[PDB]
Write a protein that binds this ligand. Structure first.
Ligand code: HAS
Ligand code: HEM
Ligand code: CUA
Ligand SMILES: [Cu+2]
Ligand SMILES: [Xe]
Ligand SMILES: [Xe]
Ligand SMILES: [Xe]
Lengths: 33, 554, 166
């Protein structure tokens, strides 16, 4: 029909869930450095 | 059955299935207890009164590990990644061999089960040396695994045969996947084949007295990582080519799926060092090179994320899907075989987030050997792979036995499904928290209740889950056996063609798929990558072998 | 419709993948950043250091607990730690904060884990191999070592102690 609004909203949660995890633990690495 | 005479593969497949699920049941019983244990409660007395032969926490973990992650998965894959390509091709697999593969799997399990049930094998599913297990464990497992080799032949045989009857034709989708899959698994299984053949088997038979534990865990992980994808891809297979039909839609691209699988064939094996970050005697550089390749092997699962979402979206739209989120509510939430996997994919997002972190080299040092890792993978294997397995019963079981499913079983499953997912969610939260709270995994920490007081609140989630999933497992069993135990037989639905998805193709596709169908080239490509990543390391290691004597610590 | 979607999806898939790889290459450089710093010490030494596991606490740097701590630089202190069947040697380790502690850990029996709670020291201790990690404590106290690798039935009870010096 048009732009995959649903799928791009899914990959959003994903990429955000990725950054939370990766930045969230990337700081604990330096906080235990 | 003229059904089985006309489709003997059906029978072989079924045996694989049941055996697998049987294995999943038994291995799953210890799961609630291991959850309660991680909630700081020690339910193991009760376990021991019920199951007398159980001697400790660690024997039940081994059994948990082995039956669930190893036996169950392998059997399923062997069932899916052979039956599906067969039916797609409408060709019969070499049945001598196929039946041979099953017995091997059966026999292998039996022989390996005994020393596990006899507390002769309390080593864990990883069986790291110098911890020494009974020969019949290492001989049992070897057989069982080798069973896959047969499966690899069988599938390749089919493939060669079909290419003959269709000269110049692109390999059909599922068959392409299965092909890459098994090749990929062949390459992956070497690592383990070596370990067992060179060290473990002669070690356990008496022939040597020592085995280098580093070279042992190096070879193990050569195989140890790709096997997780050996577990995954059969579910991926189903999600790509079967779920979209279930959802009322189509696969949105044949090339994309081919690509995903192609990347796995290339990037699955040469990443094992990610499991060995905390290890000594392995260059940090090669640990960086492997950390890069691991972030790369996540690309395939990134592609899948989109491709499947779009298809599911597409599906919801054809159903009467509203706005940004309508399509979702348009989906068949009444159909298990739809619900099960979709839930798994949800939990996968956290799972795969967990894996990207574990793969970032230095960041591993925060969570290694902690209960964060069981949290990571229970989303992966115990959630997505298992649910998928479960839900696929609803089209598969009927397609094999002819036994239709009553509406009551159909809702029974929907309950099993939700509980299992929910419980998986709770625990996921309860093992991730305590993980960052330095609680180590593989631990009977309910025998030391005051060791970890800062994990107060997560210990609760673990408890909850334990219960949740204890119920879910029960109902499954009941739901499971209700189906297999009924004498309703509709020999027409057994003959019903498998509900494969239709595939939206494009103009560009042709030349791209044509490239990908260069399998013999990609295989050697994949073979070269492993040599380049392991080669260097393994040479020095076999130059400086320092075998140490075996220990029994149970 | 259906063929219209196909080119729409395969067009944001191309833009999703570009973004994906850019995002991963930012992780690579933010991993390539932690490799040039002082934090990159807790990485086990790459060069092989073979030892016998059956004559470690009889002859050599791990025989005598007392000689565990040894100044080897102006502000460097090479500890020789010995991860064994449910326990650590020396217990407790005693080293000054602000100093560069270069641990050299092995085992006489099976594999052990050397996890210092609150730090980045997390290394696998292998029989017949020396596990060599560099670290600088910048906080005082009693640091707890946990054995994160299943080493038998007394594995959940194997803990250590590093009293850094205040
Ligand atoms: C099948 C089971 C498994 C999968 C899959 C898996 C995936 C990964 N793993 Fe892993 N793993 C590691 C890295 C990864 C990475 C980078 C990935 C990647 O493949 C993951 C990429 C996945 C994604 C990036 C997510 C894609 C999400 C999708 C596709 C879902 C979208 C959902 C939709 C679209 C639904 C929407 C629908 C609606 C209705 C809204 C590392 C580190 O590098 C360790 C070592 C940790 C340690 O030190 O012990 C590790 C450890 C393990 C262990 C412990 C083994 C042991 O006993 O010692 C197991 C069993 C395991 C299994 C599995 N693992 N892993
Ligand atoms: C009945 C539901 C289940 C529950 C409540 C459960 C719970 C747990 C818990 C709490 C652990 C951590 C044990 C520890 O660190 O000491 C664990 C380990 C594990 N689980 Fe499960 N589990 C379940 C089913 C499954 C399934 C279906 C699979 C995969 C097919 C699986 C695979 C594994 C593996 C491979 C381990 C690690 C074993 C080891 O380290 O030796 N589990 N489980
Ligand atoms: Cu060393 Cu547990
Ligand atoms: Cu892995
Ligand atoms: Xe097995
Ligand atoms: Xe084995
Ligand atoms: Xe594994």
């Amino acid at each position: 029909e048009e732009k995959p609004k649903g799928a791009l909203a899914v990959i959003l949660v994903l990429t955000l869930t990725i950054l939370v995890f990766w930045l969230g633990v990337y700081a604990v690495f330096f906080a235990r450095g | 059955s003229r059904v089985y005479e006309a489709y003997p593969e059906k029978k072989a497949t079924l045996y694989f299935l049941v055996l697998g699920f049987l294995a999943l049941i038994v291995g799953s019983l210890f799961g609630p207890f291991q959850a309660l244990n991680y909630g700081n409660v020690d339910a193991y007395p009760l376990l021991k009164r019920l199951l007398p032969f159980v001697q400790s926490y660690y024997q039940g973990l081994t059994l948990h590990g082995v039956l669930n992650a190893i036996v169950f998965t392998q059997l399923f894959a062997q069932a899916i990644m052979v039956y599906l390509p067969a039916r797609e091709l409408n060709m019969r697999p070499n049945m001598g061999l196929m039946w041979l593969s099953w017995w091997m799997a059966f026999i292998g399990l039996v022989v390996a089960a005994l020393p596990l049930l006899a507390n002769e094998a309390t080593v864990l599913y990883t069986f790291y040396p110098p911890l020494k297990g009974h020969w019949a464990f290492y001989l049992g497992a070897s057989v069982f695994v080798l069973s896959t080799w047969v499966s690899i032949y069988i599938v390749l045989d089919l493939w060669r045969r079909w290419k003959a009857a269709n000269p110049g034709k692109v390999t059909p989708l599922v068959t392409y996947m299965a092909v890459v899959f098994w090749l990929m698994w062949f390459l992956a299984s070497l690592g383990l084949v070596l370990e067992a053949v060179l060290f473990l088997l002669p070690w356990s038979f008496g022939l040597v007295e020592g085995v280098d534990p580093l070279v042992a865990r190096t070879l193990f992980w050569w195989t140890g990582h790709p096997i997780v994808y050996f577990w995954l891809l059969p579910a991926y297979a189903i999600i790509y080519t079967i779920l979209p039909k279930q959802a009322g839609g189509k696969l949105v691209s044949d090339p994309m799926a081919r690509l995903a699988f192609l990347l796995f064939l290339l990037l699955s094996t040469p990443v094992g060092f990610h499991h060995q970050f905390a290890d000594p005697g392995i260059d940090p550089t090669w640990k960086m090179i492997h950390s890069v390749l691991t972030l790369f092997v996540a690309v395939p699962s990134l592609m899948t994320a989109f491709t499947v979402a779009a298809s599911l979206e597409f599906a919801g739209r054809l159903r009467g899907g509203r706005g940004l989120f309508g399509w979702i509510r348009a989906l068949p939430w009444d159909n298990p075989a739809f619900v099960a996997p979709v839930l798994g994919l949800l939990g996968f997002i956290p799972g795969g987030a967990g894996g990207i972190v574990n793969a970032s080299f230095t960041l591993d040092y925060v969570v290694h050997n902690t209960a964060w890792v069981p949290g990571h993978f229970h989303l992966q294997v115990a959630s997505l792979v298992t649910l998928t397995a479960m839900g696929s019963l609803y089209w598969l079981l009927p397609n094999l036995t002819g036994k239709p499913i009553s509406d009551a079983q159909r809702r029974l499953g929907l309950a099993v499904v939700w509980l299992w997912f929910l419980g998986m969610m709770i625990m996921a939260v309860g093992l991730h928290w305590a993980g960052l709270l330095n609680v180590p995994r593989r631990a009977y920490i309910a025998q030391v209740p005051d060791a970890y007081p800062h994990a107060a609140v997560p210990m609760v989630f673990n408890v909850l889950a334990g219960i949740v999933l204890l119920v879910a497992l029960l109902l499954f069993i009941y739901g499971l056996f209700s189906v297999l135990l009924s004498r309703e037989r509709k020999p027409e639905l057994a003959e019903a063609p498998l509900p494969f998805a239709e595939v939206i193709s494009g103009p560009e596709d042709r030349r791209l798929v044509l490239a990908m169908d260069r399998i013999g080239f990609w295989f050697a490509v994949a073979a070269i990558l492993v040599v380049l990543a392991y080669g260097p390391t393994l040479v020095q290691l076999f130059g400086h072998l320092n075998p140490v004597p075996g220990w029994r610590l149970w | 419709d259906e063929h219209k979607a196909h080119k729409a999806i395969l067009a944001y898939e191309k833009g999703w993948l570009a973004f994906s790889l850019a995002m991963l290459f930012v992780f690579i450089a933010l991993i390539a950043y932690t490799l040039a710093t002082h934090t990159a010490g807790v990485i086990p030494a790459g060069k092989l250091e073979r030892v016998d596991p059956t004559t470690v606490r009889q002859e050599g740097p791990w025989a005598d607990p007392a000689q565990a701590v040894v100044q080897t630089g102006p502000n460097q202190y090479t500890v020789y730690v010995l991860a064994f069947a449910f326990g650590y040697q020396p217990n407790p380790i005693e080293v000054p904060q602000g100093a560069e502690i270069v641990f050299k850990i092995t085992s006489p029996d099976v594999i052990h884990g050397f996890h210092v709670e609150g730090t980045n020291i997390n290394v696998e201790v292998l029989p017949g191999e020396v596990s060599t990690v560099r670290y600088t404590f910048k906080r005082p106290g009693e640091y707890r070592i946990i054995c994160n690798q299943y080493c038998g039935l007394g594995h959940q009870n194997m803990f250590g102690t590093i009293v850094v010096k205040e």
